[PDB]
């Protein structure tokens, strides 16, 4: 029939904004998004079957509409690979680094098995390629510095 996935991004400007819903709600030029603000799967599965479903007992202040750059690269790879997507933000929300001897964040979200595709700014570098698996780049980047207000 279709591929159901589950998709983890974070808010980062200007590859991912965050628009606040409609009053009945629908997303207009974007796709719905939740944040449980947490990073366990058992609750998100909860909260997405309870989504999906005749009965929706969810806060407002988990829906919130997201659309940009990366969420439109999204939407493209959905219409032309036909699986249709849910979405969600992480808990923390600080991308991830080496901690405590398992990891943190969005390639800890991963390892742990909670969403089948990560797309937000995400520099590989690695560390991370050889844990998590990586495409080919779609973007570059440097690291620039930013010195304060002019002179004065």
Same mark, same amino acid.
């Given at each position: 029939? =279709?591929?159901?996935? @589950? *998709?983890?991004?974070?808010?980062?400007?200007? #590859?991912?904004?965050?628009?606040?819903?409609?009053?009945?709600?629908? /997303?207009?030029?974007?796709?719905? /998004?939740?944040?449980?603000? $947490?990073?366990?799967?058992?609750?998100?599965?909860?909260? #997405?079957?309870?989504?999906?479903?005749?009965?929706? $007992?969810?806060?407002?202040? #988990? =829906? =919130?509409?997201?659309?940009?750059? /990366?969420?439109?690269?999204?939407?493209?790879?959905?219409?032309?690979?036909?699986?249709?997507?849910?979405?969600?933000?992480?808990?923390?929300?600080?991308?991830? %680094?080496? =901690?405590?001897?398992?990891?943190?964040?969005?390639?800890?979200?991963?390892?742990?098995?909670?969403?089948?595709? %990560?797309?937000?700014? #995400?520099?590989?570098?690695? %560390?991370?390629?050889? *844990?998590?698996?990586?495409?080919?780049?779609?973007?570059?980047?440097?690291?620039?510095?930013?010195? @304060? $207000? @002019?002179? $004065?």
């Amino acid at each position: 029939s =279709k591929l159901h996935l @589950r *998709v983890v991004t974070l808010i980062e400007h200007p #590859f991912v904004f965050t628009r606040e819903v409609d009053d009945e709600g629908l /997303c207009p030029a974007g796709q719905l /998004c939740l944040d449980p603000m $947490t990073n366990d799967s058992s609750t998100l599965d909860s909260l #997405f079957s309870s989504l999906h479903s005749s009965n929706d $007992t969810v806060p407002i202040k #988990f =829906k =919130k509409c997201c659309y940009g750059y /990366c969420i439109d690269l999204l939407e493209k790879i959905a219409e032309d690979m036909n699986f249709d997507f849910d979405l969600y933000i992480v808990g923390d929300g600080k991308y991830g %680094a080496w =901690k405590n001897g398992h990891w943190t964040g969005l390639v800890g979200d991963l390892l742990r098995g909670t969403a089948h595709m %990560a797309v937000t700014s #995400f520099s590989i570098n690695t %560390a991370r390629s050889q *844990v998590i698996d990586f495409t080919s780049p779609f973007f570059s980047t440097s690291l620039g510095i930013l010195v @304060r $207000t @002019r002179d $004065t």
